[PDB]
Design a protein around this ligand. Structure first.
Ligand SMILES: O=c1ccn([C@H]2C[C@H](O)[C@@H](COP(=O)(O)O)O2)c(=O)[nH]1
Length: 248
């Protein structure tokens, strides 16, 4: 893997380390999560993955807070943000050091409804459409099955991730592998309002990760937070290169 070029400037976050292909930031100040509302951390982080790769952005905490897992497109030159939701019905705080924020690369592939190309080219994921109307009540999870197999790509593995638009509205998708038998996709509404998602609405994205990026082995090179403990995410072995001019 060629270098991941990045810029980072944010007095409220500490760069812990950029090691073995993963950059990790930690919060230096208390982050308040109001209940029933989205909390968005503006990271002051900018990054460009090498050829053939996308970037994975995720948060880790032992507190009752769930973060959106972000898929970062190769063409994205804006600021990276972490989107957080509160699991509780009262204020939850992330005290200093309680939130870790990770960025790492992965190889992906692209096949040529319900699986759709986004209208902007070299994007990592393909939009997946809802097969039925769903009503998502506050602080509840709703699941839906996708049964028809996606195209098979040699040496790659279809996965499902959420998108940031619904995440901002309080709706998170739990990332998961789309195995041959079908996938049950779970949507959780962390807001106080009922969200009605209609049949055919895009509700998640399909990403083909190179098979090397999924492992059962725990190590400083993998993380169970992303897609869960069965399918550990093992990022590409890239080097981070600071390029200050990327900061906007
Ligand atoms: O958690 C995230 C997810 C995405 N993005 C940026 C990079 C993506 O290329 C772009 C669009 O994301 P989606 O709307 O496809 O999720 O927003 C973030 O900053 N944080």
């Amino acid at each position: 893997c060629p270098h991941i070029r990045y810029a980072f400037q944010n007095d409220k976050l500490l760069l812990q380390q950029a090691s073995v292909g993963r950059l990790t930031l930690v919060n230096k100040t208390t982050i308040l999560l109001r209940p029933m509302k989205t909390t968005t951390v503006d990271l002051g982080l900018y990054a460009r993955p090498p050829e053939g790769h996308g970037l994975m952005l995720w948060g880790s905490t032992s507190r009752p807070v769930t973060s959106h897992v972000g898929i970062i497109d190769p063409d994205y030159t804006g600021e990276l943000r972490l989107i957080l939701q509160n699991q509780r019905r009262y204020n939850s705080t992330l005290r200093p050091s309680e939130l870790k924020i990770h960025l790492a690369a992965f190889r992906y592939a692209t096949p040529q409804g319900p699986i759709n190309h986004p209208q902007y080219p070299g994007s990592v994921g393909l939009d997946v459409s809802l097969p039925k109307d769903l009503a998502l009540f506050p602080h509840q999870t709703v699941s839906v099955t996708l049964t028809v197999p996606p195209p098979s790509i040699p040496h790659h593995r279809p996965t499902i991730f959420g998108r940031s638009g619904l995440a901002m509205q309080g709706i998170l998708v739990k990332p998961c592998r789309w195995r041959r038998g079908g996938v049950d996709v779970s949507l959780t509404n962390f807001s106080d309002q009922t969200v009605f998602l209609n049949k055919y609405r895009r509700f998640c994205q399909l990403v083909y990760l190179h098979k090397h990026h999924l492992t059962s082995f725990y190590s400083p090179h993998s993380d169970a937070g992303v897609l869960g403990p069965r399918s550990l995410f093992r990022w590409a072995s890239c080097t981070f290169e600071e390029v200050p001019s990327l900061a906007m």
